[PDB]
């Protein structure tokens, strides 16, 4: 499935 | 250069608390999610908790829920782990790590997942009901039972101390060839025990003095033990 | 949780060898697999992500492949600084790690020298008896060590320690301690350590009789 983005940007 | 510098570990009894800190430099700390991960010899590497870049969301591994809190202060560039209600099984090296897009940086879309890249140097957390105790130092004395060919073995058994570490030298550091000081084992009592041995010519036993020098700084125990043959 | 397993747990290799480490998952993880390297007393270092992408600055002798449940890490030509432990990690659902594969220095088979030590009178006077068996400078690391007291196998009342691989001759050593109460010790005669290792042409038993001292 994957783990969600925890950073300020998607880069 | 990305840098994560940790502090706060130590030795405590169960039920007590510790707070770990992780200070970041070399990157824009407030842009990144952060993690705590822990490591033990038996259980290996275990993820502990994650926190969003701005602290707006966070979650935990099941075994620490209700006891550990992850937090951060983006004005001090610091990540924290508040560890309450500590248990013996929380004993580990604790690492902070920076969240990382686990995909090509220029890719954007549904097939993305996140992991973590740079780790701090680690801080040791030891949780035990044992209390500080210096070692007994017993001889491992050379005999026909510890000879093979023209080599004899002799040593010292440094038994029932807490916490780590102990240091052992031989003949005040003049004897190093053939010395093996073994990693300590943790006994079911919660105390450690260590052996330090040296192999020497069997012909030397009659005339050469062998003394192991043991220092256990936490208990202020310092012992010189002369080991003679049986 | 998704369970990760690596194989083998220890791998012996020489400088210049091609080395491959495998990692399996308990269910499909897509390509969300990362690899880390760790040396003693140091933090893990990020090597590879999405199974096959090298982190910037990692040497190109490293590479990775795989999808689904089966992944590999390959070092095309092992360098002296590549002896280390390598961990796989899935990041498809939370984060779980394999148990690690240690890459050790390969050398020729070396038999242990075997030594036994009776308990000291100082320890006996305090009420306990520790017997120590030493295996010195052997290779490979796997060795069979058994404690026998008047021919009864002892299980659960000994502990062992193994050194790191020696910097000079690439061998291991092993220390095992059998502990009894003084009372139990004085009820038996023959204390023996028996060692089996492929470098020895027979099992080696070192023993003493209580009171032989």
Author numbering:
A (entry chain P): 5 to 15
B (entry chain H): 1 to 52, 52A, 53 to 82, 82A, 82B, 82C, 83 to 100, 100A, ...
C (entry chain L): 1 to 94, 96 to 214
Copy the relevant paper text:
As the most abundant surface protein expressed by Pf sporozoites and with essential roles in parasite development and invasion, Pf circumsporozoite protein (PfCSP) is a major target for biomedical interventions.
Comparison of the 1210- and MGG4-like binding modes revealed that the N-core conformation was largely dictated by the HCDR3. In contrast, the MGG4-like mAbs used IGHJ4∗02 or IGHJ5∗02, shorter gene segments that do not encode an HCDR3(-6) residue, and did not contain this steric occlusion, either due to having a small aa in this position (i.e., H-Ser100I in Ky15.11) or because the overall orientation of the HCDR3 was angled away from the N-terminal end of the peptide (as is the case for Ky15.1 and Ky311). In particular, we demonstrate that the MGG4-like conformation induced by Ky15.11 was enabled by a small Ser in position HCDR3(-6). With a single point mutation of this residue to Lys, we were able to alter this mAb to adopt a 1210-like binding conformation. In addition to the change in binding conformation, we also noted a register shift in the peptide as Ky15.11-S100IK bound the KQPA peptide with DPNA in the N-core like all other 1210-like mAbs crystallized with the KQPA peptide (Ky15.2, Ky15.8, and Ky15.10), whereas the wild-type Ky15.11 mAb positioned this motif in the C-core like the other MGG4-like mAbs. Although both binding modes were mainly mediated by the antibody HC (55.9%–73.4% of the total BSA), we observed that 1210-like mAbs had significantly greater BSA contributed by the HC compared with MGG4-like mAbs, whereas MGG4-like mAbs had more BSA contributed by the KC compared with 1210-like mAbs. Between seven 1210-like mAbs and three MGG4-like mAbs, we observed that the 1210-like mAbs exhibited significantly greater inhibition of parasite liver burden than the MGG4-like mAbs.
